[model samples]
Target: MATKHGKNSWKTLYLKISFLGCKVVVLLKR
Candidate 1:
């Protein structure tokens, strides 16, 4: 079952994590 709430969701967090992946990768290169 799927329900809709007014806040954030896991998919949104996953997208944020995807964006941060590159940032962390560059940080590690140092």
Candidate 2:
């Protein structure tokens, strides 16, 4: 159960980071 929860948390964080990275890259390019 603990491991499953941890994996979910990491997945959410990774998704957020990817989204933020894309936004930052676009702003920089513009």
Candidate 3:
């Protein structure tokens, strides 16, 4: 149960980071 929770948490963080990264890149290009 603990391992499964950790995996889900990390996946959410990674998704958020990727989402934020795209926003920054778009702003820089504009």
lDDT of 1 by residue, 1-30 (tens): 112362556567666679898789989997
The list of candidate 2 runs beyond 4 A from truth reads: 1-8
Each model's backbone clash number: 0, 0, 0
TM agreement with the true structure for every prediction: 0.53, 0.49, 0.47
Candidate 2 residue lDDT tens string, 1-30: 234656766777777789999999999989
- The lDDT for every candidate, in the order shown, is 0.67, 0.76, 0.77
How far is 10's C-alpha from truth in model 1 (Å)? Answer: 0.6
| Rank ordering of all candidates by TM-score, starting from the highest | 1, 2, 3
Clashing pairs in 3: none
For candidate 3, lDDT tens digit of each residue in 1-30?
334666766776777779999999999999
Off by over 4 Å in 3: 1-8
Off by over 4 Å in 1: 1-8
Best by TM-score: 1
Candidate 3 RMSD computed on C-alpha atoms after optimal superposition onto the true structure: 4.9
Candidate 2 lDDT: 0.76
By summed lDDT, which 10 consecutive residues of candidate 3 come out lowest?
1-10
Measured on C-alpha atoms, candidate 1 has an lDDT of 0.67
Q: After superposition, how far is residue 28 of candidate 2 from its true place, in Å?
A: 1.1
